[PDB]
Design a protein around this ligand. Structure first.
Ligand SMILES: CO[C@@H]1O[C@H](CO)[C@H](O)[C@H](O[C@]2(C(=O)O)C[C@H](O)[C@@H](NC(C)=O)[C@H]([C@H](O)[C@H](O)CO)O2)[C@H]1O
Ligand code: CA
Ligand code: NA
Length: 205
């Protein structure tokens, strides 16, 4: 319904142990939107049920003339904190709908089709925490023997990786094995690994 408010959302990827914040933009031909609900598909016209319960949202400047124009769309904040105990797999996404109402009571229609994703329909994808980070591997630590790093050398590699990766969670644990393999264990206990060849060299040859 192009006489109902129109919504532009996005690909709302979120990560265990991390806060998220996205904005959707809403316009209406009347220039005004009075109400915005984000909801699961189930329930019928009056439902506001939305899960997971940690998905929050808010819309400032509701119910004012000109609050929802093409040149200055209404914005809805979609935010929350993803718990560490969320299940993560290829199916750990949640398809949700943004419904907005204009002064005539026309509400954005919910159409159950993936071609509407990024409009009034959006997918909230929950990923493990390691997926938020792409550890930098540009550091180089020279060790005596690549097949047998000492404790000091293992700590040196971990410190080099940390120094190259100020953005990874401070409480993520960087450990290095006896052959220089790096494991980054995130707060949600997911891991990234860095092969030794990318962080360690020796002068044995
Ligand atoms: C009516 O059936 C639902 O229709 C919606 C679209 O309107 C979805 O297709 C939904 O399926 C999913 C989804 O929300 O995309 C498929 C996901 O794999 C499920 N996630 C998990 C972690 O199992 C969700 C989830 O079960 C649901 O969103 C709970 O509110 O459902 C259809 O079930
Ligand atoms: Ca309208
Ligand atoms: Na990663």
């Amino acid at each position: 319904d192009t006489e109902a408010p129109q919504v532009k959302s996005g690909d709302y990827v979120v990560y265990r142990g991390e806060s998220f914040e996205y904005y959707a933009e809403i316009t209406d031909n009347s220039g005004q939107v009075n109400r915005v609900v984000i909801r699961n598909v189930e329930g019928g016209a009056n439902s506001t049920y939305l899960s997971p319960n940690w998905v929050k949202y808010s819309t400032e400047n509701l119910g004012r003339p000109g609050n929802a124009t093409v040149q200055n769309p209404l914005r809805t904040r979609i935010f929350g904190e993803v718990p560490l105990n969320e299940i993560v797999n290829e199916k750990s996404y949640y398809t949700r709908y943004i419904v907005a109402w204009d002064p005539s009571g026309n509400a954005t229609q919910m159409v159950d089709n993936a071609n509407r994703n990024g409009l009034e329909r959006f997918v909230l994808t929950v990923k493990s925490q390691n997926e938020k980070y792409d550890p930098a591997e540009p550091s180089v630590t020279y060790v005596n023997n690549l097949s047998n790093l000492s404790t000091s050398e293992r700590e040196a590699v971990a410190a080099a990786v940390r120094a190259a990766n100020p953005n990874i969670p401070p409480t993520a644990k960087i450990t290095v094995s006896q052959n220089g393999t790096v494991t980054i264990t995130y707060p949600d206990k997911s891991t990234d690994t860095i092969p030794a060849n990318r962080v360690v060299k020796d002068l044995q040859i």
